[PDB]
Amino acid sequence: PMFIVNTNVPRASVPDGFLSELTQQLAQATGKPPQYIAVHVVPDQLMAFGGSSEPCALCSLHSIGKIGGAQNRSYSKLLCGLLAERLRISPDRVYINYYDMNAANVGWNNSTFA
Amino acid sequence: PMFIVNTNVPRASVPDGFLSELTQQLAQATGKPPQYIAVHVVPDQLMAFGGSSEPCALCSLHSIGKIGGAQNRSYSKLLCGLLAERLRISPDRVYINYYDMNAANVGWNNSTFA
Amino acid sequence: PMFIVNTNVPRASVPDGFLSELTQQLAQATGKPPQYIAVHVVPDQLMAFGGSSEPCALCSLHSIGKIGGAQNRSYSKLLCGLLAERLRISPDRVYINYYDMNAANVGWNNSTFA
Ligand SMILES: COc1cc(-c2ccc(/N=N/c3ccc4c(S(=O)(=O)O)cc(S(=O)(=O)O)c(N)c4c3O)c(OC)c2)ccc1/N=N/c1ccc2c(S(=O)(=O)O)cc(S(=O)(=O)O)c(N)c2c1O
Numbered sequence: 652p653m654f655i656v657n658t659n660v661p662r663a664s665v666p667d668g669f670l671s672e673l674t675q676q677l678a679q680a681t682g683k684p685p686q687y688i689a690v691h692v693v694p695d696q697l698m699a700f701g702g703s704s705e706p707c708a709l710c711s712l713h714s715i716g717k718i719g720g721a722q723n724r725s726y727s728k729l730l731c732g733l734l735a736e737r738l739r740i741s742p743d744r745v746y747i748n749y750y751d752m753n754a755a756n757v758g759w760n761n762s763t764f765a
Numbered sequence: 766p767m768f769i770v771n772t773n774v775p776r777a778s779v780p781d782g783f784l785s786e787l788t789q790q791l792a793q794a795t796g797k798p799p800q801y802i803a804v805h806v807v808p809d810q811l812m813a814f815g816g817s818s819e820p821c822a823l824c825s826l827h828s829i830g831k832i833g834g835a836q837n838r839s840y841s842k843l844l845c846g847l848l849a850e851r852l853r854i855s856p857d858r859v860y861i862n863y864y865d866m867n868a869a870n871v872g873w874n875n876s877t878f879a
Numbered sequence: 880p881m882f883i884v885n886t887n888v889p890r891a892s893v894p895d896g897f898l899s900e901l902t903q904q905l906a907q908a909t910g911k912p913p914q915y916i917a918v919h920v921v922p923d924q925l926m927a928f929g930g931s932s933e934p935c936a937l938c939s940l941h942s943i944g945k946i947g948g949a950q951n952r953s954y955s956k957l958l959c960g961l962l963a964e965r966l967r968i969s970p971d972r973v974y975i976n977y978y979d980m981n982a983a984n985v986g987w988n989n990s991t992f993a
């Protein structure tokens with residue numbers, strides 16, 4: 652799975668340890684081994700949410716399967732939780748787009764997952 | 766809705782008010798409430814369009830609904846118009862990918878829109 | 880087609896000519912003219928792959944058609960090869976998401992490709 656967070660919070664506000672915490676929490680939530688989890692955090696962005704420049708985040712989570720209505724509600728609770736507690740971003744200023752990828756449409760290590 | 770622009774135009778060439786202008790104009794073109802519109806501008810990027818490093822932009826508009834053949838033409842006209850006028854990027858060096866998101870696949874406020 | 884690579888390798892490690900090499904080789908792999916290929920390299924990113932931050936890349940290739948099981952295997956071998964040779968990124972720390980876009984969902988030059 653791959654999780655990306657783009658945010659206007661400055662880099663100095665992202666705690667040491669945050670990529671590793673995301674990695675573990677995501678391995679647990681998706682049930683995938685942490686070796687297959689990739690995480691990307693992009694701070695200091697020029698962005699607005701509802702017109703406002705208060706702390707916000709635009710995120711995505713791509714996974715081959717493990718995406719669906721109930722799982723996505725559970726991921727959002729987890730990930731909004733983490734963004735609130737670690738980056739002090741309000742959950743109503745977070746979007747997370749979920750993508751259930753076909754294994755044939757994900758390249759890795761010179762091939763695809765199909 | 767979430768609109769993202771990545772461009773090789775430098776930050777100093779992004780005029781004050783640009784994020785607000787996008788928010789406002791997208792609210793109107795899409796008909797959706799502006800409190801839900803997020804915008805994100807990423808300047809100074811290392812990019813090429815057609816092999817050329819002349820100003821260009823690669824963009825995404827994601828929304829729950831309001832995505833379709835006629836509507837996307839209207840957004841393309843609007844958004845190429847703003848990138849030409851404000852960032853001096855030629856419309857034929859702009860790509861915009863449109864995504865009609867399922868509500869179950871967008872997290873917000875600890876849950877999803879489902 | 881549009882190819883984006885996000886990587887933690889520093890900008891000074893991206894060799895001169897790399898965006899042109901990606902442009903040329905993708906034009907060949909996809910069969911589309913290079914005038915229509917866009918590429919975007921994002922170095923110096925805060926990322927982890929499998930819990931750690933050795934060189935890695937998270938990529939996307941969007942194309943109108945020319946996306947499918949065999950083609951994507953070939954694109955993955957081509958793009959992992961380039962990232963390994965040119966950026967010193969191991970193929971097993973690369974993910975590439977492939978997206979077959981509908982023409983009506985790609986804006987360009989004030990309209991869409993529909
Ligand atoms: C805004 O639109 C929606 C909103 C909701 C909704 C509302 C409220 C929610 N949360 N409320 C609260 C309240 C208090 C909270 C408090 S508090 O202390 O009590 O204050 C503390 C905390 S805390 O942080 O725990 O402390 C909280 N979290 C709180 C909190 O979460 C919420 O949570 C997830 C979700 C759900 C669905 C919606 N829209 N759905 C669709 C679906 C399809 C559409 C299509 S189509 O069908 O797909 O085509 C086409 C088109 S169109 O083409 O554009 O016409 C459309 N418009 C579509 C469309 O709109």
Ligand code: NA
Nearest residue numbers: 817818819820
């Ligand atoms: Na130049």
Ligand code: NA
Nearest residue numbers: 824825862941
């Ligand atoms: Na896109």
Ligand code: NA
Nearest residue numbers: 713938939976
């Ligand atoms: Na992607």
